[PDB]
Amino acid sequence: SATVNDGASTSGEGPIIAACVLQRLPLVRPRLTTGEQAQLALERQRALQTGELDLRAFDPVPATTAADSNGDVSTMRRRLADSLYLVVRGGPAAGGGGGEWAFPQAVNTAEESISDTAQRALYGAIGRSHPVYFIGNAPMGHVRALPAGTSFFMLAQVVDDPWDTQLLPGAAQELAWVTKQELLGSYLSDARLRELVSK
Amino acid sequence: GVDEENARVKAMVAMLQPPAPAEATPLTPAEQAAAQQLQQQRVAEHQAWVKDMTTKFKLQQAALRALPERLRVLAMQPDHTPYPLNRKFLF
């Protein structure tokens, strides 16, 4: 992370946001269909064959929890078969519930650069509690809503983090945990950025 | 007679690979068209994944142009922090 002594701070008059998204890795392997994979693996092992010519304390761990994923999106206990992404619902108007949505966002310093700003933003949203690692120093998507307020989408991932709602500084209201198949569940608030996150 | 080493190397040379334990499988075209599907799975999966990577490459190429040179300098730093090893893979 290098910072130049001088630069044109065009992003001081324009609120370009150093906003980062937490892409969680899915912990365990998703279950593939046993019948078709078993038939295919049987075919490949037949081809391999013809080509060459604690005990009471161990339980196989279940990969499913009773609570479903849709609707309740509070904590990390829903889908180990799919990636989940931290989506912050946009904050209230005066200190109550949320209306339109947003992302975990923080506007950049006019001098200090975007990616380290987003790493600091998701570093101070845990309140110096647990280390959260980062993926890339370059943004993934571009924002067409405001040409001055174009948010730069950096990416990060989960190591271990029990989150609190009262520590995200991008006007936090709630926490949403969804997959790329359902990143458009907030269509009433998001207009066209939800189409650009589909890449 | 034979020592333990001699019986060991006999059962070891004989079972370096297990010696011919397979029925030789023939194939005649009175089947279903499956090898077409077998190439289709891998071709479609690898091509969709590499299209995703090339589109991501296009976005990361076009990302860093509406922004001044210090933002390039943070964007064009070619080093990475070592990975924290606490990222357990697909179990």
Added chain:
Amino acid sequence: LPRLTAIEVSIPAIETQLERDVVDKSELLLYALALEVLAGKPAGFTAPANKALGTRATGVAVRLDAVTEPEAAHLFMEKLVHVLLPNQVGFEGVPPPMLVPPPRRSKAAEAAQARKAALDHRKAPAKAHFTEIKVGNLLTYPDFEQNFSLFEPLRGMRVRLVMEGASAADCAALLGGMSLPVLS
């Protein structure tokens, strides 16, 4: 995702050859069976072009990633990250130049091997690494652990890596995100 293109597995056994013709072909024959179990690909008796120390081949070499469909290389990396790491002497993290850590930083002399104390050649097309697995690690391999009567002697084997990723440390870091203690 950043992945590799080539990998090799070799057991350089100078314990087999220290003479003109007294080669341990039967000892490397069980070593060949051990490499067939460990690698996941048919073993090869490493016939030396400089075969002036033995009547027959010395050591066993298997290439796991030269062929297409790179399942063998990934299975080799999965097996080594699963069980081959813990018995290493001086295993508290890996320094990036020598990808296997000794219980020291100084006094790492090179007597009869090459002087590659760094990662590889300075230009780095060839990412030659001294990944040396201990004899005890082959003793504690679980298939060998429950079949010790078939693999009675074990010899130190060294691994050399070829990565498509530009830097050796960052390419090793993604496979250290496979839970390999290479962080240091």
